[PDB]
Design a protein around this nucleic acid. Sequence first.
DNA 1: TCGATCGATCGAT
DNA 2: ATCGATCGATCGATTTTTTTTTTTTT
Lengths: 585, 627, 223
Amino acid sequence: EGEQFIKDIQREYVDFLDDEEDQGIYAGHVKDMIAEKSKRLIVNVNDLKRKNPQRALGLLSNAADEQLAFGRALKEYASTVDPGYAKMHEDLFVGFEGGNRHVTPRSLTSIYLGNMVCVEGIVTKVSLIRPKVVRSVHYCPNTRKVMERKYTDLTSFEAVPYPTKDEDGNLLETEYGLSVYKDHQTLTIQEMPEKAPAGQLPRSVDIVCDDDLVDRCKPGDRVQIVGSYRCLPGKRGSGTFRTVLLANNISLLSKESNLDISREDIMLCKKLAKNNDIFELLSKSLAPSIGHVKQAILCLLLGGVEKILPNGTRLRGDINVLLGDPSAKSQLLRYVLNTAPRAIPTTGRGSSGVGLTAAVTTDQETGERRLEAGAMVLADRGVVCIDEFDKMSDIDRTAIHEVMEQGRVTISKAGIHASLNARCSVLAAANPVYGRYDQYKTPMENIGLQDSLLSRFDLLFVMLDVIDSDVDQMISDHVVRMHALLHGKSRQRHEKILSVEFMRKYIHIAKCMKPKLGEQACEAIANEYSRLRSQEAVETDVARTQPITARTLETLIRLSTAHARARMSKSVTIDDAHAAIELVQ
Amino acid sequence: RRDYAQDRESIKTFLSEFCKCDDDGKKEFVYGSQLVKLAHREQVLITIDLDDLAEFNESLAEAVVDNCRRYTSIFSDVIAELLPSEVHAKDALDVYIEHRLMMENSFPSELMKRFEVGFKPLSTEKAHSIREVKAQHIGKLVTVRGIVTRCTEVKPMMVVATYTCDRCGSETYQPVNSLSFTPVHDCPSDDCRVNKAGGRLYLQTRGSKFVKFQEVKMQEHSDQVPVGHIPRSMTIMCRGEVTRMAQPGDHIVVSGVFLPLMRTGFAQMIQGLLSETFLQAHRIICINKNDEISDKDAELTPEELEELAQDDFYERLATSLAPEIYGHLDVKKALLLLLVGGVDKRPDGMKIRGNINICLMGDPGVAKSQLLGYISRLAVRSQYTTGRGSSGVGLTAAVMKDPLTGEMTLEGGALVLADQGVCCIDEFDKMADQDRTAIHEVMEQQTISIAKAGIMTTLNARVSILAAANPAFGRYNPRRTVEQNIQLPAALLSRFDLLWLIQDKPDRDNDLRLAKHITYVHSHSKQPPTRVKALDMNLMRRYINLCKRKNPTIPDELTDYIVGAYVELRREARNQKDMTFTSARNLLGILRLSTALARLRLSDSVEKDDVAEALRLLEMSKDSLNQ
Amino acid sequence: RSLCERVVPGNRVLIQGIYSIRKGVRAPYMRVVGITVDSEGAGAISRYSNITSDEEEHFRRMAASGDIYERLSQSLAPSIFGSRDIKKAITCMLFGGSRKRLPDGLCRRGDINVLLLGDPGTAKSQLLKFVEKVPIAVYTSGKGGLTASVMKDPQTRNFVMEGAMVLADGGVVCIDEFDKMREDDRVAIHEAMEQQTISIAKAGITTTLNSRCSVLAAANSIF
DNA sequence: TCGATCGATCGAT
DNA sequence: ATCGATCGATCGATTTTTTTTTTTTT
Ligand SMILES: Nc1ncnc2c1ncn2[C@@H]1O[C@H](COP(=O)(O)OP(=O)(O)OP(=O)(O)O)[C@@H](O)[C@H]1O
Ligand SMILES: Nc1ncnc2c1ncn2[C@@H]1O[C@H](COP(=O)(O)OP(=O)(O)OP(=O)(O)O)[C@@H](O)[C@H]1O
Ligand SMILES: Nc1ncnc2c1ncn2[C@@H]1O[C@H](COP(=O)(O)OP(=O)(O)O)[C@@H](O)[C@H]1O
């Protein structure tokens, strides 16, 4: 027990416990009476300033033991309120939760030391886990007194700290079971970089965590955090200085469950579902800044549908498509990176890690042997885009064949046989070998790659640009329209019924349902596939009818499934058939 | 918190006052039966179940589950000095102790281990997962399921090492339980005390102990991994009398106690108080693909006879393989020939391989990857890889440090382990260029020659091969021929027994057939309705194994005509000048299929109509472009 | 203490420093003892402002002067004759237009880009060297990339990103011989100069950074 | 945990 | 009573490696 003000500080955090606001709400039915047992209470600094400013901004200036005093006061309180759950005799760290100073990883700059502050950056390096060494209820049969000894280190509190031949030489059976342990973790953050000056390199940070907070996202998302600063080691007293962060609660800033989702928003969705001609709207929703597809790109944004059998096998449910000369195909994929979740562009020139790892490690603090990640499992249960496809090498393509079609990734990097679950889709971009060409010579052989992929993909297709002398003034009219609010109220609309946010919020239920097939798809699909393989190869189109297989069925069923999710009609109809199939023809 | 005295009496009372009468004829002592079984020197480890301790008491029915390390040692010294019932010179350790006292610092009873105890929870409590062992599983005997990986072999661990000065004849007791230690100085005795009469004591394993000490690696199920995560692992130290209780590829269920670990060493990287833990266990009940769920640890005749005479057909076993589509009937039965085989002998010293290896050619939509992915599941000890899914060392052996010894041994790839079965490969052409020699080598069976160290790289692979690849741009162009449309090594194409190409031209009424075939795979989860009773996979597993053990003779009465069959074979393909190749190994092949086909007869009655199917089988295996 | 983010790389410096060691073969280094900068015309005038109201005054008084553009079409060459319509938009290329992002995706192309090809003997090289000379820019020509820099510091064995269209993110770039450099390194630059989202996907990183650069192209046609 | 450092101590002289 | 040799308590000093991604030339 150091300086006597520490205990004034204990009672001053007790001085939060006056009346209904905290003596009523914040303590009691809060974790253990409600029996969630997530030890960390929820603090908000603003109320602290509104009660005790010297104890509010004493915290965001120093945190020597104010956390520990918060915890001491909490156990003193709950021991009175409900001692039954007072059996977790540890520190019980708490929130400090809640724009005073929110500088970047680039600007955690030689100050804020001894402060508790805010950071933003990239979810990255979702990394390895270990447990922690606390205190152990030793024992000696010769004397039969179960003594104790607590162990510390700097990353938990200030001070720094197994017994053998303790008293004079008597027995020591180190009793585990009543010896306790936290959970421990280490990972990092990177600046969300597009605030960068690209004359400079976006900088980095270092963060450490603790028990009931562990490993709460995947590397490749965006996040907020609010934590404190510590710096232990030698610094020419022996060699310079380093950083680390703690004292925080987690904040991911890309979810929907973050939204207060009551039974009313679903009610608006299901009310408006009855409106039939909404598909043509949602097609004209996605790309309000560009003619031109997206009726189906939507279905690609709906993942797919998974179908298994008893103790047999399983299938992949999702769709993959693409078709075009230069000049709005290399600007229609950024409707995915920043429209919808888990979207990762790739290069068109990048090797050795689309799904590879290289597994390289170099004498880790612990025994990290061999592993790195890839660029598909990041996109599990969603989507991928690429630009400049055809110029990709012919190396990693076959990995795409495998992991697309088989719907599982069961690979090895020469050290370890590996298996996982990556069940995603992908796009890319397109370029013919000879520039401005798809029509006079042939439709095919203007693309130049294996005819195996169109089975792996779905579509042999076409995309071009010009017009003759009559409609050229009509494209002039549309181009000048592209080059306000008038007459997009002739487009009977609202910026809340057609938007980005509500459009995103129609994810949850369309992906939670399982709109089973009835029966009346069957004769239609069969007769149509018959006509398809029969007479698609005549009248100027014989050579553009090669890639048909018995794979248009799984695509058709993917399509009617997806279209059955955009209005949640727990059934499937002929109108869904038309709206799903007219693309193929 | 609790006491070591009345608790001791309670557990002794449990040891004695125990005639748990679960049913009729149970009026004696179960643990007293186990006691006299110790008295037999037959049993050396009792297994314990909560039901006994469920009915006796409640503390130690919940007090031992969290500690597991004290009440067991009390159980140890409790029973160690309980002699209710020789011979002396029967056990190597005990006979060495009786050597050493017949020859004659107190000896522990820990030295005379001579018997052990484990546990067996009640209701494999639940399938707790290697991920979810969070910050409350220290010391607690938890039940969990994992997946095996990279097993090594039995090693003897040490517990007590004794020296002897050779000047005072001292028999010291230096017990050890951790990994590392140091012995004692020259004379830690009283006759060899500070008095100058001291020499230097020296170890003797004779009056010392060793213990079974196995180690394996433990990998995850890859069914409950998080959505955006990667498979993890954990380590095993399975002690006691359970070494050799797992194999690579057993979905095991292990029950033991989590514990921490102190990798003593450098005080900076280590000594950081970070707890690089490890596992401990006693009981390995592998619930998937082990001695429990697989019987015969298939030859058991009586239990299957009721179904054996219950049915009599072959095609019933035919289309029961991947029964979710229709079509390609003649492929599945011959594939089923691949699972059985069974033609083994040592005629003239030369051994004949009986593993069929066939490929799949032509893929404008055929479900090529379906048969492979299915049969690799149903076929016990199967694998699956693709063209650029693995390098040459991924297929062949490799090297890695060894936690058991560190010997830097060789570990093999997919084909290295799939012997005595079938290793499946898909999309063969784009596998690799040098890989074709790698598959050229298996045609001289049990011969995997590598140049990794390039010394010998000898290895006995007795695998089949399930090949499958695609044609290049096009599918038998009107002018193209074999080795023209395909760009595979024709020598490699030579070394197969059945070539298999799957080409589907438009059939105006077969498409609707399959459309109604596969669409019913999705409204429900079972294709064949009310037309035949397709068999369960599990009964399939034994029904295939029983056929193998026959090994019939050959009918000389048809040997006179098998050669004539080869005559018409080699002639009706020879009637044209430039048809595809017809090989002289056909007579060595036709003999190898009719045998395995008779294996499912289990009769040694290969008949004239027996090969009558094989003749049309190879007959259609070629000439697949006539119409 | 206060002079990080005082110098971006790619600049001309004056320096006041000191040459002192850290540990007879022992090591060198130097620090700042009160840095300042250069005046190669405006040697360091690249991010900050010690320009004064006098400078703004002179500037904007030049601006309204409606005989400045035809004045500036004769600015680059105090030694070359003619070629004025070629020159009326080698100077606008510096100035750039507008990088207008919108509520949808369309971050439309900000800068502009240049072409020229012609028989030798018309002073191509000096002109492009002059456009390099006169805010920030760099110059190569052919033989250089399609790959970016995923190397590894032999210290710690990781895959860092050293990153040089990066170095024109407000500057520009000029090259000659798009012709005589073959196609293995033209595709990354196919991409960069239409979206500026320079992507990376090699190993376990997908940090599609970006850089806003323009570009100038000389050429040589056969015969 | 290993090595020389240094200071003390026990018979000789 | 002076001095050298041996014993022994006291002090401080050591413990980072196997794949990959560009690059020049056959
Ligand atoms: N209908 C349209 N919708 C959206 N943008 C358009 C449209 N028409 C023209 N544009 C604009 O014109 C430019 C077209 O270039 P774009 O990015 O499509 O090339 P690209 O298709 O990527 O080239 P490549 O396919 O060869 O890589 C873009 O900046 C785009 O914003
Ligand atoms: N129009 C001109 N007026 C004055 N001097 C000129 C003119 N054209 C060229 N010169 C002189 O010739 C030189 C310019 O030649 P330059 O290097 O441009 O040829 P180039 O364009 O590089 O030829 P190539 O394109 O074949 O390499 C200058 O040094 C200049 O002194
Ligand atoms: N008649 C059919 N019955 C069942 N499935 C079929 C049928 N026709 C096609 N399919 C589908 O076609 C797919 C073919 O994939 P596959 O040919 O194995 O790929 P690859 O050509 O790369 O081997 C199968 O996964 C299956 O789902």
